């Protein structure tokens with residue numbers, strides 16, 4: 001499959017196609033990484049993460 | 054929760070509990086942020102007044118994670134009707150902010166199209182709460198969880214004695230005796246994606262609990278994402 005259909009476009013969280021290319025984004029409590037794919041927490045206890053620590 | 058497993062430390066940290074004047078837990082909820090809780094609309098007339106408790110894994114004993122919060126504003130969906138349980142969704146504004154810690158963390162709100170393409174298309178979701186352990190049993194003292202597969206919508210409609218609207222989806226098992234139940238009501242249905250849990254549904258109703266040929270019915274959160282986002286401005 002094509003782009004977001006193929007492995008979520010290599011994005012950690014949200015994927016939407018835009019100008020053919022893929023654009024990744026993140027939920028609240030995260031910021032997109034320099035690679036434009038990974039979602040990095042901005043503080044402890046970001047949403048969606050099981051609090052094992 | 055009928056069957057399933059109990060939530061271990063840090064496994065279901067988005068679980069909230071609506072408690073009444075007598076300190077009894079009567080419904081569940083989902084933590085969305087420091088000020089906001091997602092719950093079912095029908096839960097808001099099973100008491101005259103209530104509070105929100107977070108970090109609770111055991112209702113009969115006290116535990117370090119626990120904190121009580123009072124609701125400032127209750128945002129019930131004006132189209133909710135108890136005849137069908139359609140539009141079974143409400144947002145709670147807390148007076149004071151939640152402190153995130155062990156056993157206390159929000160579930161992520163997904164984007165509308167992505168959720169429908171990517172989350173709804175997963176094999177299973179997870180549902181938790183302090184609800185009944187058998188259809189006719191008592192409330193569980195411990196927070197339990199259950200992995201529930203997404204059910205095909207046509208099969209879902211053919212199984213139901215009551216209408217399944219666009220604001221509802223089916224999850225659970227056909228014959229296997231595992232399902233959510235009374236008291237789990239208003240609680241979290243989340244879906245996992247790359248080690249992250251997104252809130253995909255709200256425990257709404259079912260024809261009893263764990264019955265053969267019957268599934269659990271959940272409020273479809275993706276139909277209300279703009280509405281929820283609008284609630285979190287006021």
Ligand SMILES: CN(C)[C@H]1CCN(C(=O)[C@H](CNC(=O)c2ccc(Cl)s2)NS(=O)(=O)c2cccc(N3CCCCC3=O)c2OC(F)F)C1
Nearest residue numbers: 136137138215233234235256257258259260261262269270
């Ligand atoms: C406030 N408490 C008392 C109610 C709230 C909703 N309730 C029920 O759905 C009960 C118990 N089952 C459950 O709560 C759930 C099972 C699976 C999920 Cl997911 S939730 N199932 S039930 O059979 O006993 C039932 C009891 C009261 C009302 C209903 N509903 C649900 C809305 C549609 C019409 C209706 O009569 C209803 O379901 C109906 F299908 F039979 C209990």
Ligand SMILES: [Ca+2]
Nearest residue numbers: 110111114116
């Ligand atoms: Ca406790």
